[PDB]
Design a protein around this ligand. Sequence first.
Ligand code: NAG
Ligand code: NAG
Length: 92
Amino acid sequence: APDVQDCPECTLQENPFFSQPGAPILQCMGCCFSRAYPTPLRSKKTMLVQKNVTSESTCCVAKSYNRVTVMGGFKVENHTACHCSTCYYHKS
Ligand SMILES: *[C@@H]1O[C@H](CO)[C@@H](O)[C@H](O)[C@H]1NC(C)=O
Ligand SMILES: *[C@@H]1O[C@H](CO)[C@@H](O)[C@H](O)[C@H]1NC(C)=O
């Protein structure tokens, strides 16, 4: 691709704190790319209807965690797995 749209590939960003010769904690951080597709609808009311987002801020709430609460009681849910989308409350 031309570039990276200033966004990496959603995943774990190994804890730059807990990372030690035997324990490289994490913290899912990145971008899960985007999947948009324009479609010529009808739009009842004004030119547009209701509010809609471009959809890109995908959430990969670690599918699985190995949580290793660090400094200030951090929580890297020592991510063992990360799955974009599916959050505790989408649309916000
Ligand atoms: C965190 O999870 C990764 C992947 O399973 C593992 O390699 C690492 O040892 C874990 N870190 C700790 C402190 O358990
Ligand atoms: C979002 O709303 C705008 C309103 O103008 C519309 O043009 C666009 O097609 C909508 N996007 C999607 C994915 O429906």
